[PDB]
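Weekly sync notes, structure subgroup
Attendees: PM, AL, DS (notes)

Item 1: joint prediction request from the bench team. They want all three components modeled as one assembly rather than separately. Inputs as received:
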Amino acid sequence: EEIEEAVKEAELKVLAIVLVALRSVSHYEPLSRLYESFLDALKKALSEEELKEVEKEAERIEKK
Amino acid sequence: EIEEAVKEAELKVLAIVLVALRSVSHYEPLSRLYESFLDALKKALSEEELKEVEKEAERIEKK
Amino acid sequence: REEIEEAVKEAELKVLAIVLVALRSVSHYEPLSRLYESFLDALKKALSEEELKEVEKEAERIEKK
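Output from the run, pasted for the record:
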């Protein structure tokens, strides 16, 4: 069925949680290096639309 | 039907990250990422979800 | 069915590969080194050896781009 879709929602939600956490601390040395590392790894591993979906889910979490 | 098993993937990955962050939360500034992560966990998941990551993290820590 | 087991496992292991790649590439800075080692130890407890092997392949895949 749509297993691919359901698998992807879980990926994107976990990765958005990690993104929120790294973002909060991204100006303490050297966590800024891990922030940019994580973002680089997301860009390589996810499609462009998925990456935008991670970033949107992160902002949703960050306004909560 | 299956978002239940979707959820188990989530909580088990989050539990593995939590375990890694707990074992180094005494090396600064990692304690800030440990707290940021617990703060992101609390925001993003219901309390039942949070406690499942916790118990899964305990089962991992006991291995 | 068995399509959901391969599903959950697959989601789990690519996400862990992404985090692994992120940590690996900054592991010389301290104490990011320590969080890297500690992630590797957590993977060793939580994952089987074939799950760990699959995480590392996905990690090399990502690093290769």
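Discussion: Residues 3-24 of chain A form the longest helix (22 residues).
Action: AL to compare against the crosslinking data before next sync.
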